From a paper:
β-Propeller proteins are common natural disc-like pseudo-symmetric proteins that contain multiple repeats (‘blades’) each consisting of a 4-stranded anti-parallel β-sheet. In the larger propellers a so-called “Velcro closure” is found, in which the N- and C-terminal β-strands are part of the same β-sheet, keeping the propeller closed. This “Velcro” can occur in different positions; in the “Velcro 1-3” variant, the closing β-sheet consists of one N-terminal and three C-terminal strands, while for the “Velcro 3-1” variant, the opposite is true. Starting from a highly repetitive β-propeller sequence, we designed a consensus motif sequence that formed a perfectly symmetric 7-bladed β-propeller.
While the space group and packing differ between the crystals, the structure is identical for each protein. The crystal structures also show that the proteins are highly internally symmetric with a backbone RMSD between individual repeats below 0.3 Å. Analysing the thermal and chemical stability of the WRAP-T permutants revealed that nvWRAP-T, lacking the velcro closure, is just as stable as the variant v13WRAP-T. While v31WRAP-T is considerably more resistant to GdnHCl induced denaturation compared to the other proteins, its increased thermal stability is not that significant. Just as with WRAP-T, the inside “Velcro3-1” position is highly resistant to chemical denaturation. In both cases the “Velcro 3-1” position yields the protein with the highest stability, especially against chemical denaturants such as GdnHCl. However, these two examples alone may not be sufficient to determine a clear correlation, and additional proteins will be needed to confirm whether the inner “Velcro” is consistently the most stable conformation for propeller proteins.
Residue numbers in the entry: 1 to 286
Amino acid sequence: QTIASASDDKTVKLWNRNGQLLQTLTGHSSSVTGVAFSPDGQTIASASDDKTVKLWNRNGQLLQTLTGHSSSVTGVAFSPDGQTIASASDDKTVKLWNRNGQLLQTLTGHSSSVTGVAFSPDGQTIASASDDKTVKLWNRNGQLLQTLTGHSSSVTGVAFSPDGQTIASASDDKTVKLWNRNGQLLQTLTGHSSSVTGVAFSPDGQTIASASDDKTVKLWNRNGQLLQTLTGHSSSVTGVAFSPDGQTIASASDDKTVKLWNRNGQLLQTLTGHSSSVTGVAFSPD
């Protein structure tokens, strides 16, 4: 029932499905690059080029600042149990933190910026995307488990399926790739005409959504067959998310809006109010 949007205007905004602006989270000193909700939906985390993650409540109160990366933070995620936060950074690391802001681990191994991060559904694997053209899988002790190789250019985003067996990656090489947890390449999804900027799984695991600089969202089945292309944004699409009931898709764009869509490609709502590019979007667990 609540949508969060991240923006180059240095804020997060919270909205309802009817299009009302509920709250603006103000306090980062540079662009906000991604956003996530805790599993209980009551805490929001934001990632920023000001090199921090910030934690907020729905009244807009700043609750905590996570300081420790040496360059921009590019993405943030909560573990399924809510106890651990993961952050991705241009400083080439992922950091793991507890909810009070203390650093637990630094995951070292990528050779270029880390662009996104995700947890497996069982909470036991972390996946990271990088400009070094790989996804890496790690445990919560920081040990490297696998390196997923095969993209020809930067990897911009990564997602787990709800059943924790399949990984999806998005890339500047204009494809999404699907993988197993052993690092094997299963499928390449081709069809976008420019960089793919983000990827997500539907909650039933049957559908993949991709966002692209080609101004569209595309929806795909598990065999990599293109189902549907969502057209309407007027500038690059920078991220995509599914609602928990899987009946709504949200897209973020450099055209400064979020758009909400249903499963048949109809446009439901356009959320207007950010003064710069929208860089990411998330749904609360309800």
